Amino acid sequence: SVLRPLDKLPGLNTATILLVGTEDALLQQLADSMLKEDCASELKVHLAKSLPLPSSVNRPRIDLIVFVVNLHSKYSLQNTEESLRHVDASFFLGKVCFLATGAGRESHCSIHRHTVVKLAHTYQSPLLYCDLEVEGFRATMAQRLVRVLQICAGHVPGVSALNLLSLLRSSE
Amino acid sequence: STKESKNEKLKEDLEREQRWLDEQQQIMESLNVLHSELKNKSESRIFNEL
Amino acid sequence: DETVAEFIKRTILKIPMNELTTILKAWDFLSENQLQTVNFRQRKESVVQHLIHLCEEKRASISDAALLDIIYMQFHQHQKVWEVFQMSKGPGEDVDLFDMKQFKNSFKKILQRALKNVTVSFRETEENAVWIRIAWGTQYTKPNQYKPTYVVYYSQTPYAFTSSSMLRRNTPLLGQALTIASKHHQIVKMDLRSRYLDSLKAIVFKQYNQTFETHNMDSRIIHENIVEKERVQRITQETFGDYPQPQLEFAQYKLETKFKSSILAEREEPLRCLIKFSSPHLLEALKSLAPAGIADAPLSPLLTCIPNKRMNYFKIRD
Amino acid sequence: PLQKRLESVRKQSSFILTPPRRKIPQCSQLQEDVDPQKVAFLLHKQWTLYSLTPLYKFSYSNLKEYSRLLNAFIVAEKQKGLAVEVGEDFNIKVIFSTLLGMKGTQRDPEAFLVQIVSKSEGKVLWTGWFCCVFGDSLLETVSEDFTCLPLFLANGAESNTAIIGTWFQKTFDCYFSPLAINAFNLSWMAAMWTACKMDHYVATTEFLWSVPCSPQSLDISFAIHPEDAKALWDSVHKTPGEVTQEEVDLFMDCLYSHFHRHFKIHLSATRLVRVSTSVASAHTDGKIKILCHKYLIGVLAYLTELAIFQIE
Amino acid sequence: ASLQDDALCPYVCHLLYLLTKKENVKPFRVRKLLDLQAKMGMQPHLQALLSLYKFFAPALISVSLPVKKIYFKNSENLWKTALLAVKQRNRGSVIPVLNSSSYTKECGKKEMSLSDCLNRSGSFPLEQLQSFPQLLQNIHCLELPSQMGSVLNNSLLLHYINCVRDEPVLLRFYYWLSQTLQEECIWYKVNNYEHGKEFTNFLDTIIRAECFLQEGFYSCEAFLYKSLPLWDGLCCRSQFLQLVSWIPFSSFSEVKPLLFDHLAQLFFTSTIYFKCSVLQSLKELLQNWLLWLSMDIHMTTLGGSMNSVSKLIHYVGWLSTTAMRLESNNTFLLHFILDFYEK
Amino acid sequence: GVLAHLERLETQ
Amino acid sequence: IIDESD
C-alpha cells in the first residue's frame, strides 16, 4: 500500500504526526516531549518502525512525516532508504522532514553526514539535527516540530505546506 | 519593561566608551610626539667607542 | 625452615586485611590465646611481621602452610579458570561403598610411584566435596610450591573440577589417579570452561531451574507495530525461560562453512572463521538483544543452547 | 595574504562536494638515508596519537639546550620540594635526536625523537615522535617563523606525557589535542590494508564490535584467514588500482550477511571499535601499531591528513 | 653574607626579598643558596627566596612549588602600633597565565650582539609594565607574552594589539582561540554539558574584548560557520547572538548559504522571543557594517558595496513580513520591526 | 541588556 | 553439524 496525503477529510481542530525509525525508546521519548506541553490544537502521535504500515481502516489522515536516522547505525539508514519508496510523490511537497541524530559524538559515527545532506537535497526536504538522548535539547526540538505540524495542518491562516516549502528552501 | 532595560544598558555603554575615547586620545598624542622626536633625531665612528 | 616461613608470609600477604581474622580463625593452627596478643589496628606490615614470629616460635611444617593455602583458596575461588572432567564405568559394575581413607591412600600412592617427590593435601569440605592441592615434582627436582593444582572432587558422582595452571604436563597421570582412586574405568574432559565455579556446578548438575508447578497511559500516543512487539516478547520468553540465568563470561565458536551469497559461487572450499563473545554477564546480554531490535525474534540455536547442552566451545562444519 | 588564504581554505570545507576515492597503497623501498636500527625500534610498539598546532620559533640548530632544560624541568617537577641546578647529572636523562628519511616530500620538515633514559647504555623509559608526511595543505597557509608537525605519537606512561606536553606548550606556544578514529575511517582502513599485496601473512585479520544494550554489555570478535579475506576482497574489487566507497560497502556487507546467516544478529546496528591486519592495527581511542616496514609511509600519511583535518 | 649565620637567616631572607633585582642574581650566588638548602632542608623562607631567583634567571634554577601560604610569618612587629600613628600622619585555567617571553630566546649564542655590546636600546620587561603612564612611554617597544591568549584579560596589552596588525601574533592568537573554542563548546565536538557556566563566562570575556578594538576575531567566524547547523537556538542565546554582530563586511551572496540559510530555518519554527532576539542582532550587524563603510569613502567599488547592504535590508524585510503573518499581528514583534527601520 | 531580558522573559 | 568429536 502507498500512503496518500489527502485521502481523508480533516478532523475538527486535530493534527496528526507520524514518526518512522528503528530506535523505539528515542521515538517514545520524543513523543512524550511533544505531548507534555499545552497547545490550542489537539495532537496525536503515531509510532512506526518502517513503511508500509499494517493495514487499518480507522486511521485518521496523516499531516506530517518525520524520518529519524541514527548516524551511529547503518541499519537505520538502510531502513529509511527502503521506507522512502512507499510514499507518493505528491506527499513530498512540504510535508516531509528528515531528522538526524548523533552528530554530537563524532567518534561513534558510522555515516558521513554528506550522505544525509545529499539524501535530503535529493528528496527536496529539510534536514534537522538533534541529540535526542539529552533532555534539554530534545525539549526545544519537540516544540519546533509541533509548530511545523500546526502549520502543515492548516491551523495558521495564510500559510500552507507549499508555502512552507519556500521558507525552508536551502540556497545550495 | 524591555525599553527600560535598553535605556539602562545604553547609559552604561556611554560612560564606558567615553573612558575608552579619553585613553585612546592620550595614546594618539604620545605616538605623534614620539614619531616627531624620532624623525627629528659608519665603521669609523663605531670603531671609536670600542 | 626459611622456605616455609617465606611461603606463609606470601600467603598471608595475599589475604585482604578486613577478612584476615576469619581466615586465621578457620586455620586455627595458632592457639586462640595467642591471637589477642597481636593487634590488628596497626599497619598490615607490622601484623605480618608479628604473625611470622609467632608461627616461627611454634613448629611449622609445610603441611600446615599447604592447608592455609587451601583455606585461602576456597574463599576466593574466582582467581582461577576451571575445567570439568567426567568419569564413566562399565555396565555390569556394582555401586561402590565410598571410603574416604582408601581414596586418599590410592590417590597418594599413584602419584608417589609415578613421580618421586610430590606434595598432596586434603581438606574434607562440608556438603560432600573434597579439596586437593598438589605440588608437582619429579625424581630429580624438588616440588614447586609456586604453581600448585587444585581439584574439587564430589564423591559418589562422576564429576571433578580442576584448575588449569600447570596441569598440561601431567594431565594423563592425574586422570589415571582420579579414575583409579574412585574405581572408574574411563575419563574424558568436558569442553566447558569458566571462572565461576558455582555457575559451572549449577550447569553440570543441571539445577539452575528450580521452579515446579504444584497446587499445595497517555492514550494520545498510538503504538503501531504492537503485535510484532508482543510476538517477539513471547518468543524471547519461551526461548530463554523465566529462571535467573547462570552467570558466564565467554563463549567461542569455530566455523568451517561455505560462503553462500555472484560472489564466490565458483569457490568450493570452506571459509575459515573464529568468533568469540565476551560480556560481564553473558546470557543476560543475549536475552535482551531481540527486544532492543538488534536481532531477529528467534535467535539461532547455537546461542540459546549453552546450559542445556553443557557446552561452551563449539565447532561447526557444513 | 596567508591569513586570508587560511580563512578561505577553511570556509570551502562544505558538505555539498562528494569525497574522493583512494589509491591502493604501493610497497615502497625504504630510503637510503633511513637508519635500520631505529626503524626496527619503531615497529611493533603501541603508540598514542595526538594532533599539534604549529610550533613557534623552533630551531633544529640547538637541540642540546632544549634537552638540558627539559631534563632540569622534569627532575624538579618530580620532587616538588627542593630546587635543582640546570647542568648537573641526575637520576634520569633526556636526549633530543633527529630521524632521517621519514618525510613524505622535500617540502616537509624533518622528524625527530625525544627520549627519557634511566641511566644506571641506559634503558629507555618514554619516547615521543614528531612527524609530518604529505602536509602540503597546511604548509601553504603558515608563515616562515613556524614549524608544521601536525602528528605526535607517544609511547610510555601518561604522567610523563603530561609533563612533556606542558613544557612544549609553555615554550613553543602550541596546543596538544587527542586524536580519535571513528568507525567510518576505520572501515576504510580495513579495506585499504586488505587490498595491499603481501608475500607472507604473519597474522590473521580481526574486527571487534561493540553492542549497545542499556545496562548490559557485549563484545563480538570476528577473525578470518588472510587468504580467505583476500579472496573475498578480490570478488568485489573491479576498479583497477583504486578503492571506491561502493566497494568498501560491499566488502563490509559480505561479512554482515555471513554473520547474520549463522547468528541472526544484525552487525550493522553495532559499532566497529578495532581493526587488525597483517600491516597494522588501529583503535578508535587513537592507538596505532605498525608491523610491516614497507607500508610505513602510507599509514603515516593517512594519519597525517586526519590530524591536519582536525586542526583546520 | 649574613645568610651563613643561622640566627639571622629568616630575617635576612625577608630583607633580600625586597632588594632583589635582575643585576643582583649572579651564578655564583645561585650556588650558595643551593648549598644552604642541603644543610638545613626545606626551610619556608628559603623556598620564597629561591623562587624569586628562578623568576629572574630561569636558565639557572628550576623549582616546582606546591600550592598560596604565607612563607614569611606576619608576626606583629614592635612598631606596628606606632606605624598606625605614622600612617595617620601620612594620611593627614582556560586562559593562560602571564609569563615573560620564552627563555629559548638567545639560548645557544656564540657571542653578544654588536648592538648589545654598544648598549643600544633594548626592550621593556613585561613585569615592569603595571600602569598606563608607563605604557604611554614604551608603546613602541614591548615584550610579548609567551602565550598570546593571556592578552585577553589584560587591558594594557589590548591597547597595544588595538594597533599592530602583525601576522605571527595574529596566527598564534588564531590557533589558540580556535582550539579553545572547539574544545569548550557545548553542542559540538563530544557534546560537553559540564562547562555550562564556564563557556558563558569565556564568551562574555570575548565579547567585551571585541567591543573594544571595534572588530571581530577570525576564530569566531569559523566557529560560527562550523557550529551553527548543530545549534538548537537556546543554549547560549545571548552570547551566541552577540557574536554574530561582529562579522566582517562581505558580499551578501557569499555568506548567505553559510549563515542566513540556517538562521532563517531556525527563525520560522521558534518562539517570538527568538524572533525579537535575531531582529536585535541583525540591527546591530547593520550598524557595524555601516560604521565601517563610512570611513572608507573618506579614504569592491562603492556601487558594489551598497548592493550588499540593500540586499540585507530587503532580506530582513521579507523576514519581517512573513514573521508578522505567522504570529498573527502581534504588536510586541512590530515594535522591533519598526526599531530596525528607525536605523 | 535587551537580549538577557528576553531570555528571562522566556524563562518565566 | 556441531562436531562433538574434539
User: How many angstroms separate the CA atoms of C245 and C287, rounded?
Assistant: 9
Per the CB < 8 A criterion, the answer to whether D52 and D174 are in contact is yes
* Interface membership of D225 toward C (CB under 8 Å): yes
Smallest Cα distance from C243 to chain A, Å? 26
Torsion of CA E341, E343, F5, F8, to 10 degrees: 30
The count of other CB atoms within 10 Å of the CB of residue D67 is 17
Taking CB atoms within 8 Å and a gap of at least 24, the contacts of D225-229 are D225/C272, D225/C273, D226/D198, D226/D201, D226/D277, D226/D278, D227/D201, D228/C271, D228/C272, D228/C273, D229/D194, D229/D205
The angle subtended at Cα A57 by Cα A52 and Cα A63, nearest 5°, is 60
Cell of residue E213, nine digits: 578594538
Please name the residue ranges forming H helices in chain A.
Answer: 24-36, 74-83, 113-122, 135-153, 161-167
Residue A150 lies in a domain: yes
Which amino acid is it at E225? Answer: Y
Residue A146 lies in a domain: yes
Per the CB < 8 A criterion, the answer to whether A28 and A59 are in contact is no
User: How many angstroms separate the CA atoms of D64 and D112, rounded?
Assistant: 13
Q: Is A20 helix (H, G, I), strand (E, B) or coil?
A: strand
Short-list A131, A121, A125, CA closest to A100: A131
The DSSP H or E segment spanning C239 is: helix C226-240
Cell of residue C260, nine digits: 553462500
- Please list every residue in chain A whose beta carbon sits closer than 8 Å to the beta carbon of residue C224: 46-48, 53-54
Antiparallel, parallel or unpaired: β E61-62 and D84-85: antiparallel
Smallest Cα distance from A6 to chain E, Å? 24
User: How many angstroms separate the CA atoms of C208 and C243, rounded?
Assistant: 8
Contacts of C48 (CB under 8 A, 6+ apart): C9, C12, C13
Q: Test F3 with E237 for CB contact under 8 angstroms.
A: yes
Residue A124 lies in a domain: yes
User: Helix axis angle, C63-76 relative to C2-14, nearest 10°?
Assistant: 10
Residue A3 lies in a domain: no
The angle subtended at Cα D69 by Cα D89 and Cα D36, nearest 5°, is 80
Q: Test A109 with D184 for CB contact under 8 angstroms.
A: yes
Which amino acid is it at D36? Answer: P
User: How many angstroms separate the CA atoms of E5 and E16, rounded?
Assistant: 15
Which member of C220, C227, C228 has the closest CB to residue A45? Answer: C220
Q: Is C179 helix (H, G, I), strand (E, B) or coil?
A: helix
Per the CB < 8 A criterion, the answer to whether C121 and C27 are in contact is no
Please name the residue ranges forming H helices in E1-148.
Answer: 9-19, 27-40, 44-56, 80-91, 114-117, 132-137
Complete DSSP assignment for A120-154: HHHTT--EEE--TTSHHHHHHHHHHHHHHHHHHHT
Side-chain-side CA neighbours of residue B47 (13 Å):
3
Structural determination approach: cryo-EM
Q: Which residue has the cell 544478529?
A: D265
Chain centroid, CA D312 distance in Å: 17
Which amino acid is it at E194? Answer: E
User: How many angstroms separate the CA atoms of E142 and E121, rounded?
Assistant: 12
Residue A73 lies in a domain: yes
Cell of residue D216, nine digits: 548490559
Q: Test A167 with E322 for CB contact under 8 angstroms.
A: yes
Chain F residue with Cα closest to E279: F3
Which amino acid is it at A33? Answer: S
Using alpha carbons, list the distances in angstroms from residue D30 to D35, D295, D301.
9, 9, 15
Q: How many beta-carbon pairs below 8 A join chains B and F?
A: 12
User: How many angstroms separate the CA atoms of E100 and E333, rounded?
Assistant: 53
* Interface membership of A144 toward D (CB under 8 Å): no
Per the CB < 8 A criterion, the answer to whether D78 and D126 are in contact is no
User: Helix axis angle, E197-211 relative to E167-184, nearest 10°?
Assistant: 150
- Please list every residue in chain D whose beta carbon sits closer than 8 Å to the beta carbon of residue A109: 182-184
Smallest Cα distance from A148 to chain E, Å? 6
User: How many angstroms separate the CA atoms of D124 and D160, rounded?
Assistant: 13
Per the CB < 8 A criterion, the answer to whether G6 and C252 are in contact is no
Q: Residue D222 forms beta bridges with which residues?
A: C275, D207
Cell of residue D94, nine digits: 633526556
Q: How many helices (H) and strands (E) does chain D have?
A: 9, 16
Using alpha carbons, list the distances in angstroms from residue E97 to D11, E93, E179.
32, 8, 17
- Please list every residue in chain F whose beta carbon sits closer than 8 Å to the beta carbon of residue E280: 2-3, 6
Q: Test B6 with F2 for CB contact under 8 angstroms.
A: yes
Residue A143 lies in a domain: yes
Contacts of D299 (CB under 8 A, 6+ apart): D279, D280, D288, D290
End-to-end CA distance of chain F: 17
Q: Is D154 helix (H, G, I), strand (E, B) or coil?
A: strand
- Could you say which DSSP state residue E73 is in? -
Cell of residue B44, nine digits: 669609523
What number of residues does chain F have?
12
Per the CB < 8 A criterion, the answer to whether D168 and E172 are in contact is no
Contacts of C278 (CB under 8 A, 6+ apart): C249, C250, D218, D219, D221
Total of domains in chain A: 1
Q: Residue D176 forms beta bridges with which residues?
A: D52
The count of other CB atoms within 10 Å of the CB of residue E186 is 20
Q: Is D126 helix (H, G, I), strand (E, B) or coil?
A: strand
Per the CB < 8 A criterion, the answer to whether D164 and D268 are in contact is no
Which amino acid is it at D188? Answer: W
Smallest Cα distance from F11 to chain B, Å? 15
Cell of residue D78, nine digits: 618530580
Q: Which of E234, E237, E265 to mutate to test the interface with A (most CBs of A within 10 A)?
A: E265
* Cis amide linkage into residue D150, ω under 30° from 0: no
Complete DSSP assignment for E218-275: HHHHHHHHHHTTT--SSTTHHHHHHHHT------HHHHIIIIIHHHHHHHHTS-HHHH
Contacts of E213 (CB under 8 A, 6+ apart): E158, E161, E162
* Interface membership of A47 toward E (CB under 8 Å): no
Q: Residue D207 forms beta bridges with which residues?
A: D222, D275
Domain residue limits at A92: 14-168
- Could you say which DSSP state residue A18 is in? E
Q: Which of C276, C303, C304, C315 to mutate to test the interface with D (most CBs of D within 10 A)?
A: C276
Short-list C172, C109, C83, C163, CA closest to C131: C163
Cell of residue C139, nine digits: 625424581
Give the E-state strand segments of chain C in sequence order.
82-88, 119-125, 129-135, 149-153, 159-163, 186-194, 221-223, 248-256, 273-282, 313-317
User: How many angstroms separate the CA atoms of C179 and C86, rounded?
Assistant: 10
Give the E-state strand segments of B1-50 in sequence order.
none
User: How many angstroms separate the CA atoms of D292 and D276, rounded?
Assistant: 13
User: How many angstroms separate the CA atoms of E72 and E46, rounded?
Assistant: 10
- Could you say which DSSP state residue C170 is in? T
Per the CB < 8 A criterion, the answer to whether A87 and A118 are in contact is no
* Interface membership of E190 toward D (CB under 8 Å): no
Instruction: Show which subunits contact F, needing at least 3 CB pairs below 8 angstroms.
Output: B, E
Dmax over CA atoms of chain E, in Å, equals: 89
- Please list every residue in chain A whose beta carbon sits closer than 8 Å to the beta carbon of residue D16: 117, 172
Q: Test B30 with E212 for CB contact under 8 angstroms.
A: no
Chain D residue with Cα closest to C275: D222
Residue A40 lies in a domain: yes
Smallest Cα distance from C233 to chain D, Å? 16
Which member of D184, D266, D268 has the closest CB to residue A112? Answer: D184
End-to-end CA distance of chain D: 17
User: Helix axis angle, E302-327 relative to E331-342, nearest 10°?
Assistant: 170
Antiparallel, parallel or unpaired: β A64-70 and C159-163: unpaired
Short-list E122, E176, E120, CA closest to E146: E176
Per the CB < 8 A criterion, the answer to whether C86 and C311 are in contact is no
Smallest Cα distance from A112 to chain D, Å? 7
Residue A5 lies in a domain: no
Cell of residue A111, nine digits: 555515516
Q: Name the CA radius of gyration of chain D, rounded.
A: 22
Cell of residue C247, nine digits: 552467570
CATH number where A57 lies: 3.40.50.300
Per the CB < 8 A criterion, the answer to whether A68 and A21 are in contact is yes
